[PDB]
Each structure stands twice: as structure tokens, then as C-alpha cells.
């Protein structure tokens with residue numbers, strides 16, 4: 001299934017995922033697309049911060065739903 | 077005279093009116109300003125829909141107060157889903173069960189489901205898988221839109237709060253009998269129709285008066301402000317349409333960031349969600365392609381990083397209206413076949429006649445022999 005990863009800038013990444021994919025896999029799929037390390041990535045859904053261990057299924061994220069990408073910056 | 081108007085944004089715009097200007101006229105001021113048909117606009121002041129014949133002065137609009145403009149156009153089912161396509165709306169849904177391990181329709185349940193918890197919590201319900209080779213002991217319940225024929229992978233989110241208003245409970249805001257309605261999880265279990273729910277959500281979203289709970293996200297309690305009543309299933313906000321729902325998602329991401337300590341990039345059109353370390357005052361809008369802007373600002377003054385030093389709205393609810401808008405404020409029935417009285421223990425609609433010469437398995441709701449239709453539409457009462 002396709003999901004969208006939106007930044008608060010309005011940048012949009014389309015991802016081919018599965019409900020069983022963990023937040024870690026999503027983050028790894030983002031690294032392959034935009035080169036952002038997973039340690040810098042923070043994903044949010046309906047204002048809740050999504051924890052690495054949990055799957056998309058656990059958050060009931062449906063086909064073509066969007067996730068919010070926020071950055072933990074280091075320098076501071 | 078100036079009134080501050082909020083229309084699908086937290087950014088409120090001033091509008092030049094007079095004290096004797098009617099609500100009809102204010103709707104026209106806005107309609108001309110935004111280029112939208114005035115007959116579609118709803119005016120909301122402190123959670124109250126203003127009658128058009130009333131004037132600005134009558135509505136106690138005092139000074140720079142927030143007026144919301146909301147643009148709005150013109151079988152027994154216990155379950156409702158949000159159908160993303162082709163319905164693009166809330167629809168009566170069909171409950172379906174499968175074995176958690178092989179994901180096949182071979183799971184035979186111990187007893188059937190009695191409440192939302194049984195069908196929403198993973199591995200809560202137990203059973204036995206009847207496939208050739210599968211040792212599955214737990215059940216996996218899913219839902220599908222009932223309005224049309226469905227693909228096995230085409231599931232929909234169950235909006236457990238929505239109920240057919242079989243009871244004739246008047247809505248908390250407008251005191252009308254509508255269906256389906258939303259039932260809040262407050263002790264009183266207050267009911268609001270989906271039109272008033274739309275006004276409640278859209279206005280609260282404009283005022284950024286949604287509640288942020290770390291383990292829930294961005295939500296809203298009961299209109300009446302009842303404690304421990306935050307909407308838990310956040311896909312309920314899909315009822316607002318994709319544009320409003322996407323706006324809710326954005327504002328939620330923004331609140332989450334600010335609640336997580338970071339800041340939003342101050343640059344015009346950026347607003348990137350940035351999370352600096354506790355002791356960092358120099359914040360750079362990091363990220364390449366995006367959130368790349370990529371400005372180095374001060375965490376405090378929000379100006380270009382330097383070396384030196386630098387209207388909460390009430391949603392009015394009638395006490396009498398809240399009393400009438402309560403979901404819960406019929407023990408035994410005879411068996412359809414033998415007329416022996418059967419008692420109902422819990423929510424499950426699947427009845428079993430105790431009478432030895434009978435032992436009929438029937439639906440408590442319909443008075444017919446148990447079937448796959450009764451299971452999908454109303455396995456349990458709500």
C-alpha cells in the first residue's frame with residue numbers, strides 16, 4: 001500500500017509499505033528516498049509521536065494516509 | 077466597527093461592520109471578501125449559531141472577539157466505518173472475523189463478541205481454527221464498508237463512537253433528532269449529530285483549542301466539556317472531510333512539536349518542525365531537499381541568530397439540552413420457536429434457547445435463526 005510522509009514545509013514523500021511494517025522500517029524507507037538518518041527522523045500521526053517498535057497496523061494508518069516528518073537536529 | 081473573523085484557519089482577519097449590521101449582512105461582507113456563496117456560510121459566536129435577523133450589537137460582539145465562519149453545502153447496524161473510496165463518507169459497516177495466524181475465515185469462536193473491546197483489542201477473543209494445518213487460538217476482527225461489493229483487502233476503519241439513533245435522542249447543540257449520531261465516552265454519554273460535530277471540530281480547530289495528550293495525540297472531549305471524554309479513535313475526524321481532516325493533521329503535528337519541547341521555523345512559508353537539544357539557542361532549519369530553508373535563528377526571539385540578548389473561546393451548551401442528549405438516560409424475550417422466555421446476558425445478539433426440546437439459535441434483534449448477515453450487521457448491541 002502507498003502512504004505519504006509530509007514535512008511541515010509541505011515536502012511529500014510517497015512510500016510503498018505494508019500494515020505490518022514497523023516505524024523503524026518506515027524511517028529506513030525514508031532514508032533510502034531522502035538520505036535522512038533515522039535517528040534524526042520523528043514521525044507523527046494525528047499529533048501522536050510514533051514509536052519505532054510499533055507497526056502501522058497498531059496506529060490504524062490506512063491506504064494513502066499521511067505521516068508527519070519532524071527533525072531532531074544535531075550541530076543545537 | 078471591527079470584528080475578527082476565523083474561516084478555515086487560525087489566522088483571523090478583521091472585517092468592517094456597524095452595530096446595526098445584521099448577521100445576514102456580515103455573511104455578505106465575508107462572501108464578497110472570500111468569493112464564496114453566502115447561503116453556505118454558518119456564523120458561530122461562542123459555540124452558538126447566530127440568527128441572521130439579529131444585529132452585530134445584539135450578538136454581544138464587543139471588540140475584536142472571534143466570529144467563526146463555517147462553509148456547509150446542502151436493516152439494523154451496530155457498526156459504522158469511514159469509507160475512503162468510493163463513498164468518501166461514514167457508512168454502516170460489516171464486521172468480519174478471521175484466524176490471526178493463517179488470516180483465513182476458518183476461526184470458530186468460543187462465544188461471540190459482546191462489545192467494542194472484543195472486536196477492537198488484538199487477541200482479546202479466543203477460538204479454534206478449522207483449516208487443514210493451523211494451530212491458531214486467537215481471533216482477528218476487521219470491518220468493511222457495507223454500502224457496496226467488497227475486496228478481501230479493502231478494509232475500513234471502524235468509527236465506534238457512530239450509532240443509528242434508534243433511541244430518538246436529541247442532539248446536545250441543536251436539539252434535533254438526527255441519525256447517525258456521535259456518542260461521546262463521557263459518563264453522561266452525550267450525543268451530537270454529525271452537522272453539529274462538524275461545527276464543533278472546525279471552530280475548535282480554528283481556535284487551536286483541540287487537546288494534546290502525549291499517548292493519544294490531538295483530539296477533543298465532549299462539547300459539554302465532560303472530563304475523561306477525549307475521542308480515542310482519531311479517524312473520527314475523517315467525518316470532517318479530507319481538507320478539514322488534513323488541516324487537523326497539520327495543526328496536530330505543529331502542537332506535537334511544540335509539546336515535544338521543538339519550535340517551528342519562523343521563516344515565511346517554512347514552519348518546519350525542528351527539535352533542538354535542551355541547551356541550544358542557535359537553531360538551524362536542517363534538512364536538505366526539505367525541511368530545507370535552511371535559516372539559522374534564535375530559539376527565543378525567533379530573529380536571525382545573534383550573539384547578545386533579545387482569547388480562549390467558550391463553546392456554550394444548554395444544561396437542559398445536555399440532560400436530554402444522553403444515550404442511556406427489555407430484559408427477557410420469548411424464544412421465536414417455542415415461546416419459552418430467554419434472558420439476555422451482555423451485548424452479544426447471538427441467543428441460544430435453553431429449552432432442551434428446542435435449543436434454537438436466534439438473533440435477539442430480529443427474532444430469526446442465527447445467520448452470517450446478523451453477525452456482520454449487529455453481532456452485538458450498542
Ligand SMILES: [Cl-]
Nearest residue numbers: 246397400401
Ligand atoms: Cl438535547
Ligand SMILES: [Zn+2]
Nearest residue numbers: 159163221223
Ligand atoms: Zn463505501
Ligand SMILES: [Zn+2]
Nearest residue numbers: 175178205210
Ligand atoms: Zn488459522
Ligand SMILES: [Zn+2]
Nearest residue numbers: 262266298302
Ligand atoms: Zn459529555
Ligand SMILES: [Zn+2]
Nearest residue numbers: 247250269272
Ligand atoms: Zn445537532
Ligand SMILES: [Zn+2]
Nearest residue numbers: 341346361369
Ligand atoms: Zn526553515
Ligand SMILES: [Zn+2]
Nearest residue numbers: 374376377386
Ligand atoms: Zn534572540
Ligand SMILES: [Zn+2]
Nearest residue numbers: 411414429434
Ligand atoms: Zn426455544
Ligand SMILES: [Zn+2]
Nearest residue numbers: 439441442450
Ligand atoms: Zn439480526
